[PDB]
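Ticket #4471: complex job returned nothing on first submit. Input attached below:
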Amino acid sequence: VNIIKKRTKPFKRHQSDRFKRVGESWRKPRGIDSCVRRRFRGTISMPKIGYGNNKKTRYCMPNGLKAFLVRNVSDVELLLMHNKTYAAEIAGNVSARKRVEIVEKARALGVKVTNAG
Amino acid sequence: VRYSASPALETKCAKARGAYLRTHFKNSREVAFTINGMSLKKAFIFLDNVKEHKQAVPFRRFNGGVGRTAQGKEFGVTQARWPVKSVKFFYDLLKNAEANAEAKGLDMDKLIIKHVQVNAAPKQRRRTYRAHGRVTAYLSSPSHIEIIVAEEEVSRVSLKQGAKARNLAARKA
Amino acid sequence: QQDEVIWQVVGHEFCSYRIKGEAQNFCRNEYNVTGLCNRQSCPLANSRYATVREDNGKLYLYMKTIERAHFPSKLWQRIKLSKNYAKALEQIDQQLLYWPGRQIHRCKQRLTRLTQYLLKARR
Amino acid sequence: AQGHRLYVKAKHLSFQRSKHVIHPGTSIVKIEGCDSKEEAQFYLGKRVCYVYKSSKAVRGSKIRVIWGTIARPHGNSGAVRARFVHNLPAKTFGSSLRVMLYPSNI
Amino acid sequence: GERMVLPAGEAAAKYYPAYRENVPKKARKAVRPTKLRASLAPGTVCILLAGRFRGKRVVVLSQLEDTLVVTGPYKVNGVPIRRVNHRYVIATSAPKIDVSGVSVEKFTKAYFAKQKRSGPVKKDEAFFAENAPKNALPAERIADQKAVDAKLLPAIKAIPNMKEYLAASFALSNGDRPHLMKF
RNA sequence: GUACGUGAAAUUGCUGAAAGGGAAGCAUUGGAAAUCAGUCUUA
RNA sequence: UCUAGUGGGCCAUUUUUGGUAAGCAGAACUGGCGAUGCGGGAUGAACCGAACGUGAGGUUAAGGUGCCGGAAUGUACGCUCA
RNA sequence: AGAAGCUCAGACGAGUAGGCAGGCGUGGAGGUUUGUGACGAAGCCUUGGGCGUGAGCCUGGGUCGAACAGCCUCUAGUG
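Support reply: We reran it on our side without changes. The output follows.
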C-alpha cells in the first residue's frame, strides 16, 4: 500500500487571484449566478468528499509516518511504542536547549524527527 | 539609516543621503535613472550640461504630457526635460558622496555611481480653493534620495557510458 | 466503584494521562503497557495489570493485586532487572504465565525496545 | 551513412479530443507508411519515443527522451494512440517521433 | 510466542520491535516454462534490435528459459555469446545454420550471471579501466567462443553469401515499411 | 535616534528573474528553467 | 408531532379561447427551466442525448468524419449548373 | 475489543429558497498537562517543507521583544 494523493493542487477561493481583499482560503460560493457554483466547463473545482484520500494512507507523510507535535522529552517518550508509525516534530517555540534534548531523546528512542536540521 | 543595497561595504564604497527633500519625486526618479551606472566625473559633466540646457534628462516612466525635444535623441527617446531643482539636489548629494570617498581614501578616477534610489517621502499637506465654496488638496511630493558610489570591480558517468568512453580513448590513442 | 464505571468516568475523555490530538489519543499512564487508551491496557480503569519503565541502565516492572486496592501506598509492587535483555524477556513471561497472558507480547516489546533505547544511548 | 535508423518515422498529430475537450494523457501518432487499421495492427505495442535536445547535460548528454508505447489504432487512416510515461507537451504537435521495432513479434 | 517454547541465553531473536509485521497472503502464482515464438528455432539468423550490437545479424544457438543464447560467429561480425531477449530479435527467413554439432548445455543463467554487489558504492575511472575485453574475460570463455566460432564457420562457408550477410548490418532506408517487408 | 516598541496590507522606488503583436487574471496536462524533500545509505 | 421556505413563475409537445396580428393575453395534460452542470444544435435558461462523488480502462447516445476539428477527400445508384 | 472499538457486504452520490448533522477558527472562565518561554512568548514577512475533501493546522529561515498554548468543560460583543 503506497501513499497516493487523489489531488495535489489546493482549492483556492474564486477570484482570490484578482482581489487582494479576497484571500485564497476556500469559501463556498453562495451566488445566485456563480459559474463555479454551477460547475461550468473551464471554471475552478470545489471541495468534494469524493476527493478524500485512502483511510489507510491518510495523514501519513510520503515516508509512511505521521508527524506528531512534540514539546519536550515527555512528548518524545509518548512515541516510544510507535516509532514505526509516528515521527516526532518539535514545536516552533521550543528553545535551543530543549530542542537538543528532544533530538537526543528521539535518536535514543529511534524516532525520526521531521525538522531535525 | 540602513541603505537599500546589500553591497557598499565600507571597503571601497561611499554613501550619500538626502531625506524629505522638497523637490518633485517623479522628476528626481528620472534624474536618478539617467545617471545610474555612470562614472562620477561624467555624471558631474552631464548634470552641468542639464543645468545649462545642453543635455536633457529623459522622462521615461512619468512622461504623460511631456513634450518632444531634440536632446532626448541621445538616449533614444523623444520626451526629455531639464529639472533644475532635482539636478541641484543630485549634484549636492554627489558632492557629498565624493567627499565621503575622499575621507575614506578611495581613487577618484574610477568612481562610478553604483546605486541610486529615490523614495517618496511623507506628503506635505496644503490647501487650494475651488469653485462653489469647495476646498481641495495641494500636496507636495518630497523625495528621499540615497546614492552609493564605488570603484569599478562536474558529473559522474554510468557503466555503459564509461565503457564506451574507455573504448573510444583506447581506439583514438 | 467497579472497573466498568471507573473507565466510563475517566478513560474515554478526561484523564491526567490522556493526550488527544487530531483524531488519536495516547495514554501516558505510567501503568499502561502499550500506551494506548483502552479498557485492556488502563490499570486505572481495570483490575491488576503490569507495566515496565526504565532507569539508569536497568528496568523495573510494576505489578498489582485486588484485595489491597484500597491502599494506594502499598497497592503496587516493583521488581527490578539489571541482567540482560533475553533474561528480562524470560522474567516477564514467567511472571505472566500464571497471569492473564494477553500482556506478554506487549510487555516483551516494551522491555526489548527500552533495552534498544539503552544501547542507542550508549552508542 | 544509410546503415542506421532501426526505427520508423512518426509525427505527433494531436491529443485524443472531441471538438472542445482534449485528453493530454493519450496522444495520436501518425506512422509513415501506415494507412489503415490493419497496417496499424503491426505497430500495436511498439515503443515510440520522442527525442529532444536541451542545454543542460543530464548524465553528460545533451539529448533527452520521452518513452511511450503504442496502444491501439485510431480511425481508418492508420493513425495510432500512444501512452507516454510523461504526457507529451502540447508544443510537440507536428514533431517527429521514433517507433522502434521492438517489442517484436515477427 | 513466549520463552518456554524457545528458551536461550540470547533469545531466538534479540529484539521484537514494532507491529506484528503482517505476513503476506500465500500467493497462487506458479512459475511455468515460457512458450517461445515458433520462428526462433536454433540455428536461425536473427537481427538484434536493441543494445550496443543493434542491427547486427547473429546465429541463434539455443533457447534459454526466457532469452536466446545467441551469437554471430565472432570472426565474422564480432558479437560474442550473449543472452538476447526474444522481444528484441527479428527472426529472418534466411537459411538455417547447422548448430547441432556444438554443445549448448553449458550456457546457463549462472554462466552469464554478473557478480553480486549488495552495496550502493560503485563506479570509478579505475573501475572503467577494469573489466574491458583485455582484463577479466576468462580464458575458459575465450576457448568456448573460439570453439563455437570454429564449429559455425563450416556451415556458413557452405552456404554462399552468408558470411558477408552475417558481417553486414541491417538498416532501414527511405521507403521501407516494416509491416510490409517480410524478413 | 524623539518623523522613536512591534511596523501588516493598499501604494511606491531600486535590484534580480521572466513574459508581453488590440486587455489581464484562471483551470487541465506536460516541456523548459529554478528550487526542495523524502527515500536509501543499512539490519 | 413541531417547524422552515413558498404563496411574481416561465418554456416545449398536443388540445384550445379572445385577438388583423404578436417573442400577444388566457386556460387543459405531460415533461423540462426556475434549482442543472455535461456531449450535440457555430453561439442561446427550458430543443436533441443524457442527469453530475474522485480517478483508470472499454463501449456508446444525440451529432457527426474535406480543413479549421477527434473521426472514410468511404462504398453503391441517381438528380442538380444557379 | 479508545465495544463511542473491530469486521464483512450491497446499493447509492445534481441542487437554489429551506431544513438538519458533524467539524474548523476567535475573546474570556473552572479543571488539567512534572505544558512552552529572554538560550527568545506573542505578532509579522517568506521565490522553503508536511498534513486535511475543506474550514484550517504544523514546521524551516528571517524580523522581533514578554508573555503563551494543547486536552476536558463553561461562556460570548465569536468568522
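Residues 11-22, 24-25, 27-28, 36-42 of chain C lie near RNA strand H (CB under 10 Å from a C1'). Closing as resolved unless it happens again.
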